[PDB]
Amino acid sequence: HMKMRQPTPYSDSSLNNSPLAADGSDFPCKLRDNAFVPPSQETIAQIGEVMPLTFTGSATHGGGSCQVSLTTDLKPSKDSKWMVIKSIEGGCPANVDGNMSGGADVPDPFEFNYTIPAGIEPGKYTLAWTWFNRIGNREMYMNCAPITVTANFPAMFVANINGCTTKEGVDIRFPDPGDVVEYDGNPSNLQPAGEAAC
Ligand SMILES: *[C@@H]1O[C@H](CO)[C@@H](O)[C@H](O)[C@H]1NC(C)=O
Ligand SMILES: O=C1O[C@H]([C@@H](O)CO)C(O)=C1O
Ligand SMILES: [Cu+2]
């Protein structure tokens, strides 16, 4: 149970910590009433700028693995096409063995980053954070935020809301993580070589 803090998600005041519905019904972005209201301040990401990726919550579930992905859709739906710009395998959204202290609203001390790469054209996008928790029930977490990019990619990995089911206890390694892959966890938790993520 975690949520993205930066970049600021759409409709943050109605955005909760819960994972996506196991049946896929609220993929993408936790579909719900008025799900796609932009925050007041525009999140501007210059190409090549190191941008913050930060979280709120203490129920870190031993970490896991995350992606950062972009779509041109400003009201994403099941038909939205996503472009992965970063994969974090292990240690996301925290490199601890279980949960942390603080409440549902605590700023997560473990912080991350992403950079818009050279192949993304300037324009408005939705950015998604997705997270596959290491410990606990097999879930997929997802929050979405508008960003404006100012002056060839894998499709998003989707699991646990379909037939692809991940293995409990491991930091998964995405089949097609892209050219920007970061390992932020303990090597002993990385999914063993030769096992598929599903
Ligand atoms: C982004 O975060 C990763 C993981 O902590 C770190 O290795 C890297 O140095 C960070 N980038 C910058 C520019 O600080
Ligand atoms: O509505 C918008 O207009 C500009 C657009 O030019 C961005 O590509 C901007 O920053 C918005 O949020
Ligand atoms: Cu949880």
Author numbering: 26 to 176, 198 to 244
Provide excerpts from the study.
An almost complete structure at 1.26 Å resolution was obtained, with a copper ion bound in the histidine brace. Residues 152–172, likely comprising a mobile surface loop (see below) could not be modeled in the electron density maps. The AfAA11B structure shows a typical LPMO fold, with a pyramid-like shape and a canonical immunoglobin-like β-sandwich fold with several loops and two small helices. The β-sandwich is comprised of two β-sheets, one consisting of four antiparallel β-strands (S3, S4, S6, S7) and a smaller one consisting of two antiparallel β-strands (S2 and S5). Despite the observed differences in substrate specificity between AA11 LPMOs, their second spheres are virtually identical, with all three AA11 structures having a tyrosine occupying the proximal axial coordination position of the copper, as well as an asparagine and glutamate. The closest contacts of Glu139 in the wild-type enzyme are 2.8 Å for the tyrosine and 4.5 Å for the copper. AfAA11B contains an extra loop region comprised of 15 residues, indicated in green, which may prevent the LPMO from binding to insoluble chitin.
The catalytic capabilities of lytic polysaccharide monooxygenases (LPMOs) were first discovered in 2010 and LPMOs have since garnered significant attention due to their unique catalytic power and biotechnological applications. These enzymes play a pivotal role in biomass degradation, through activation of C–H bonds at the C1 or C4 position of scissile glycosidic bonds, allowing the degradation of recalcitrant substrates such as crystalline cellulose or chitin. The histidine brace is a unifying feature of all LPMOs, whereby two histidine residues in the LPMO coordinate the copper ion found in the active site. Previous studies have shown that AfAA11B from Aspergillus fumigatus has exceptionally high oxidase activity, low reduction potential and the ability to degrade soluble chitooligomers.
